[PDB]
Design a protein around this ligand. Structure first.
Ligand SMILES: *[C@@H](CO)[C@@H](O)[C@H](O)[C@H](O)COP(=O)(O)O
Ligand SMILES: *[C@@H](CO)[C@@H](O)[C@H](O)[C@H](O)COP(=O)(O)O
Ligand SMILES: *[C@@H](CO)[C@@H](O)[C@H](O)[C@H](O)COP(=O)(O)O
Ligand SMILES: *[C@@H](CO)[C@@H](O)[C@H](O)[C@H](O)COP(=O)(O)O
Ligand SMILES: *[C@@H](CO)[C@@H](O)[C@H](O)[C@H](O)COP(=O)(O)O
Ligand SMILES: *[C@@H](CO)[C@@H](O)[C@H](O)[C@H](O)COP(=O)(O)O
Ligand SMILES: *[C@@H](CO)[C@@H](O)[C@H](O)[C@H](O)COP(=O)(O)O
Ligand SMILES: *[C@@H](CO)[C@@H](O)[C@H](O)[C@H](O)COP(=O)(O)O
Lengths: 223, 223, 223, 223, 223, 223, 223, 223
């Protein structure tokens, strides 16, 4: 399972990549506008992320019309080969995905909330589909159930579109995604950081360190 | 999963084709007779759909006897290579399917209501079998259970006939067909258009464009 | 399980009542406005339905504010003892239900789309809660799964609010509701009419008539 | 589980009643007309069965209209207190059932092929409902599944209508009805007699009989 | 769960009665004829078992005709109040069971090999029904599945007939009968003795013995 | 299922109670110190919450030693009859719960992370036990599974301690708690507010309002 | 679920009693012989535990013959009304249990390794039966499966013998016993103390007291 | 499944290796410091184990910083080709694993307590990942459930990191690991010794020896 960082915060992206545990980044217009404050331009932020991340970087078009979407998508693609064009699940979005796929531009269909939407995006040739589990949780349905059904549907038809679980809120979204077999999760930094941690890891490390002081006073392993 | 449009209405077909999510069309004598009013003739309707749709186009014979069905099927085949001959599940229909299969004329066995009917159609060599889920629902049995059994039976014997789910009434027939693994669904236009839609997609799109207005006055993505 | 008729059409209600299989009626503002055209007034439609139907008749308030809802609910209550006040699942609607319940005015909480909303309505003391299965089917979620969860939740806490399955589109919504154990279904007239019918009932009746003609050419039973 | 005999053949009924395992009888127009030959009249056949069978005896109306059904029902009732009036699942039949039940005349609703039909018959007050399992088997659906659903539905609502499994063709219909918990099965005579039999019973009897000739030559148990 | 001994050997019964774990006895013509050798008469054997065993003692008739079975059953009854008359699952056997039940003579229907035979014996009023699990195992059918189905059936109808698992061959027949909830098992003596034993029991005692030798060489518990 | 608000924010508590959907409040030392800023005293905050909430108000002791806990608990209890003393799952906490239970002071055992801790608290007589699902989610285990096991354990032993699900982060914790059958959930305000809402409720209300304008221009229900 | 301490060590018993979570004690000749060193005698140990523990205190006989066991059991009973006589699963042990049960001396059958042994002990009238889960684990079978079967068997027959899970090695034996519904677990002291503990309890407690220092310098709760 | 020995005790390792059932060894700082007492040095213990064991030997770094870990890991690697570097699940440990993996130095990520940590370690390229089942049992969570999830996750993504079950306490951890399909278990010596043994193996051997003595008083097989 690949793990993407769901942020436009450059410092978070740097730190996450410096852990070697981040395989790419997803952004969206909200996450970008959060960071485009106090003189920082959205265009510089996008170029900087594309520079520092070796893996895919998902960047969302803002136009709602087919022509504007394909035009913006070609510009996004021109910024670097790791750019992935994020495109909403709409009638025009699907048309744009089909055209862009034929042009060998990688695409990520976003704002997906049920398995049939996901299937339609795959039929259009989309590289990744992003169902939003947290926003489903918000409306009182277990979002992970939609991930499970997409995985089954994609398995049934040997679909090559990757399932990119998005709107992740907690480490159990991540655990359930991995057990289901989703291709990718995208996580906020706070969630990313918690995935490495466990209280018994902390405790066991402290105890081993104390045990070793009985045999080596300076805490080193001299071999 | 392939998605066909279940209509003889030219504008619905034109619209759904232009969306890029319609892989074919199914018709029947009722659908065609609805469009053959105020001047239009059934031959023009059939020829016009064949022209618009690159994928399979299923057209039903009207004869009930073997010889009439085979003669009408050859005339339907003559209209274009993408024509598929729809034939009812009857003794004469099965004989016709076996004859036409040997002539390499694609066939679609219709009016199928249980799994063993579907198996018999497959044994006669039919290209597609169309179980009617909505008409089973109407009589108080969950029509999707028949799709699940047909899928298992066809998997057991490596059967190459495609399951074409028909008499579809709502987007859950479509969801459950995909989870089962049916090869094709054919859907009325009203159903097809709903498949792309979800209120959270609409809410999330409107919110993203509002966020973007905080960094781009004219709502543009300049890169 | 009670079966209500989901219409404001007086001819449909008269017919279903005469069949003896209609235990009540649900209306909403869409249904009522469909009938109050070309002269007929909405207050007259409501009153005629109250007169015809011996069972509960659900009539929805139009105000969105607590004070207006309660005022409208009292005028609804005053039209006849079988009137039930239909109230939307909103903050003001919950407050209205709590007040009307304390006044021994029967209430029906509507526009419910997940099990926790249904629980909230039951906690406000609502007489009936109406989850909309067909509108969930429309957005790609199996609406009956919400009914199943509500039944389990209500069973857990011995809740007395009745589950009134609404937005019903087909006889399998009805079948599954009964298997789950929902208290009420409300159905449109074309669904109601299908519930009695089965092709093997029709076929068996015809056959038994022919059998009887052998021992009695007139077709009567003389005992 | 009560066990009824599904026949109008007086020799079969006598033979089966003579065994102590027959709790009642069901007839229908076909079963009666098969026996009403060679100067034998349907009225005598019915009266004879009523006299010989302590338990319920189900006798089917032939009128298809409400008023004719109620009039035939009362005449059937007048033939004996054990008579039960068999009435088809139609709009007129439901109306007739509701009238007869209020007159304390026992009823049996027949020609039932799905669970919601069975529920409607129970809601009209019918004493017994008879789903036809064999005729469902004939059309490619496992009829016993319908019994299972009706049992669950009736349990959910504490329904007092007895489930009378009809159109029984083999002893596995009977076994499955008992495991489900149906209240009654009605069986043809050939099925009835097979229910007592098993090859290991026969083989065991013969061995014990031979084992006993070792200790007692004449085959007696002198105590 | 009650536990009976399945034998006619007086020494086995005497030994098992000494243990306090045998609740009754079953015999059959094969078992009785094995002990009636070298001048021991079957009449003596039956009387001595009745005297030794406080609980039910099952003794099988030898006639196959109704009158003879009822006559023999009455002689058996007269031998002691704890006598239970064992009667085969046949047409005359069901008739005899019904007659004897009405005479308040306890009965045990034997040579039962499926659940419907067990149901029929229960409907005749039988006190105990004895399905033969070992003989089903012999013919390649898991005999315990029949016990499971009988338990479910008897539970569905609140049947008072006790399930007496017979033809037991090993301790797992016993374990599974207890997990199912059968009322009684009857076991051969070699099975009965095995039920108390387990190698970890034997090992644990020896070790506790050795431990106590450290504290008290005497081997006593002076309190 | 009772719903508590998990906050010490007086404005949130006022608003939640003014919806009639809040059955009590839980606090802890963190939530209280959040509000005890800029001249507001912790003691006034606790008294104010106890004043405005009619249901239970859980207030946590700060002492870690048994004597300090029982002393603080008696002071908390003295502030009002709705006060519940929140006590951590420690050796001294359990001793304090036992003493306080005998004094008829209601208690809430907090910081519970597995089902056996919950059982020990119930054995001590605790009124409520609070397992922390969100903090389990944080460490990579599905916290709701612990709620499920506690419910089963409590069911097994007819335990009267109420399960109070705490550390709730999202509406699916709430839905799963209700399906499991937990006695109480305690939720932050943001979660509380989301429980009432659904996009289809919003949409349906807007549509009904527009439909009614065709029949009543001023949007009122004049009866 | 009752929790007993499985030890003869006086200080462990004293400590666990003072915690309020120990409902009784089990001993065996090995546990006692461990404490009967450096002067202390087994009689003083047994008498001293009986004094400290209000609940049941199980004390094992050392004789292997019926008469010795019954005599030792009467002497154990004489030591206090809370004494329970532990007797192995052997033929003489079962006889002793039956005799002692009639004398109203409470008993505990030990060295039980499968469900049928437990059933036999229950049929002899034993107060508690102790299956050894840890010693089953040692030989490669999951000992908790035996507890689950015993629970089902005892439920089937409304058996009043309490299941006392023994040879417990870890807190998951305890968890699974509670989920199954065993009546009692007996645990070594090391296991008992771990049952109250969890790292997140420790982390959360330390964090709460840190938060409170921001509003109360001396860490006190003044109300 | 490979079986490693989890000890630094050279006498235990020698013994297990001589049995032929030990495929490798795991150590940690606690285990090593237990043996390096009263003269013996830690560097000598490690070297002797590397010499004795032909299979993998896991030796844990003591530094907590990336640079120190890699330096220590290289000195460990240099001691022999069978050395595996054990590295804790921390941010610096993941970085170290990634670096060492690129240097073709085999690694073992330790102190893993949930499936997502195990996934992270596999993504860093670790040779073996060691979840601690016994430490999870200690805190009241069934540690084997984490092994089951890791196996499923690893199967989903065709991950080549081997699952090395650690913190093993009993032979049922071993049994369940094999049923799940874990790649390796590492066991303490007292667990290892039990894996070969079963009381029925011992009993059957004794019996077969007695049987042979009948046909051969010396006890040999002369062929
Ligand atoms: C792009 C899709 O892969 C992502 O940035 C998604 O927009 C977010 O993951 C959605 O998350 P929120 O629901 O928190 O906006
Ligand atoms: C041909 C078979 O695929 C289709 O046109 C079918 O006739 C329809 O799908 C049947 O649907 P209705 O039950 O709505 O006629
Ligand atoms: C009132 C009970 O809430 C009913 O009239 C419901 O409004 C309808 O059943 C909703 O159905 P539609 O989704 O077809 O409007
Ligand atoms: C009356 C209803 O219980 C019965 O006589 C039914 O008509 C028959 O059981 C129907 O059986 P067939 O399918 O064999 O007519
Ligand atoms: C009487 C009925 O309970 C019993 O004695 C049975 O005949 C035997 O249990 C049958 O056993 P076999 O199959 O071993 O004869
Ligand atoms: C008291 C226990 O019922 C509550 O206030 C709990 O402390 C909180 O619910 C714990 O939640 P957090 O994990 O967010 O502190
Ligand atoms: C008596 C029966 O409850 C207990 O003392 C048992 O002897 C022990 O629980 C057995 O445990 P070990 O297997 O550790 O001896
Ligand atoms: C190394 C593999 O990670 C092993 O030595 C582990 O540290 C131990 O198996 C952990 O066991 P304990 O929980 O008994 O220390």
């Amino acid at each position: 399972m690949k793990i993407f960082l769901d942020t436009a915060n450059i410092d978070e992206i740097r730190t996450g990549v410096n852990w070697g545990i981040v395989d790419g980044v997803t952004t969206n217009p909200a996450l970008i506008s959060k960071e485009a404050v106090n003189g920082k331009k959205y265009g510089d932020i996008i170029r900087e992320i594309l520079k520092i991340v070796d893996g895919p970087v998902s960047v969302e078009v803002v136009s709602t019309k087919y022509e504007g979407m394909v035009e913006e998508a070609r510009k996004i693609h021109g910024l670097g080969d790791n750019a992935v064009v994020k495109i909403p699940m709409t009638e025009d979005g699907l048309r744009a995905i089909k055209t862009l796929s034929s042009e060998h531009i990688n695409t990520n269909c976003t704002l997906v909330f049920n398995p049939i939407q996901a299937l339609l995006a795959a039929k259009a040739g989309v590289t990744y589909v992003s169902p939003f589990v947290g926003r489903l949780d918000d409306i009182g349905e277990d979002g992970m159930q939609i991930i499970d059904m997409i995985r089954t549907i994609f398995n049934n038809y040997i679909i090559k579109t990757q399932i990119l679980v998005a709107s992740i809120r907690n480490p159990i979204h991540v655990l359930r995604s991995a057990v289901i077999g989703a291709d990718v999760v995208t996580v906020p930094f706070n969630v990313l950081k918690s995935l490495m941690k466990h209280p018994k890891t902390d405790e066991g490390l402290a105890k081993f360190l104390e045990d070793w002081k009985k045999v080596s006073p300076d805490g080193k392993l001299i071999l």
